Design a binder for these strands. Structure first.
Ligand SMILES: [Cl-]
Ligand code: NA
Ligand code: NA
Lengths: 66, 67
DNA sequence: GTCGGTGACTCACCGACG
DNA sequence: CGTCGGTGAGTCACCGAC
């Protein structure tokens, strides 16, 4: 019965291992969702920039004509 | 015995597969952490370019409208 | 000095496939 | 068919933190 501290240790470490694996799955899912969102925000910014640069040059050529 | 050699070879094969499996998990995380850091940096730069262009556009609409 | 976190070995399980 | 590899989970050995 002295070796019963050994049994509680196995049970505690089992839960610790499950927690470690669950945190790694959660981190992977968090980072993937974060990447997806950041990729979307990058595309929108690149789109807004492209439209703004077009409008900038349009106005520049209107002004040069007057 | 052949039973022992076979059981040991299976453990070797599985130890190889486990190390490869674990490595791919950590490499996916490492790859994703880098991409997140890069995208945050790039989007900050893009946001500042957009902000400037918006002001430049605003002023040009004023120069045009003043005619 | 005990505890939890984690890398690594191992077994169970399942689908892949020659 | 029978064996393999990929993966989840239990275990051990080890370490750092409080
Ligand atoms: Cl070994
Ligand atoms: Na958890
Ligand atoms: Na290894």
């Amino acid at each position: 019965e002295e070796e019963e501290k050994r049994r509680v240790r196995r049970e505690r470490n089992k839960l610790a291992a499950a927690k470690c694996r669950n945190r790694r799955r959660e981190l992977t899912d968090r980072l993937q969702a974060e990447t997806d969102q950041l990729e979307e925000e990058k595309a929108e910014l690149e789109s807004e920039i492209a439209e703004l640069q077009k409008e900038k040059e349009r106005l520049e050529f209107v002004l040069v004509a007057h | 015995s052949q039973e022992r050699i076979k059981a040991e070879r299976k453990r070797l094969r599985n130890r190889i597969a486990a190390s490869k499996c674990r490595k791919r998990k950590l490499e996916r995380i490492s790859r994703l952490e880098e991409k997140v850091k890069t995208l945050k940096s790039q989007n900050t730069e893009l946001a500042s370019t957009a902000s400037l262009l918006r002001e430049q556009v605003a002023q040009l609409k004023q120069k045009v409208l003043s005619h």
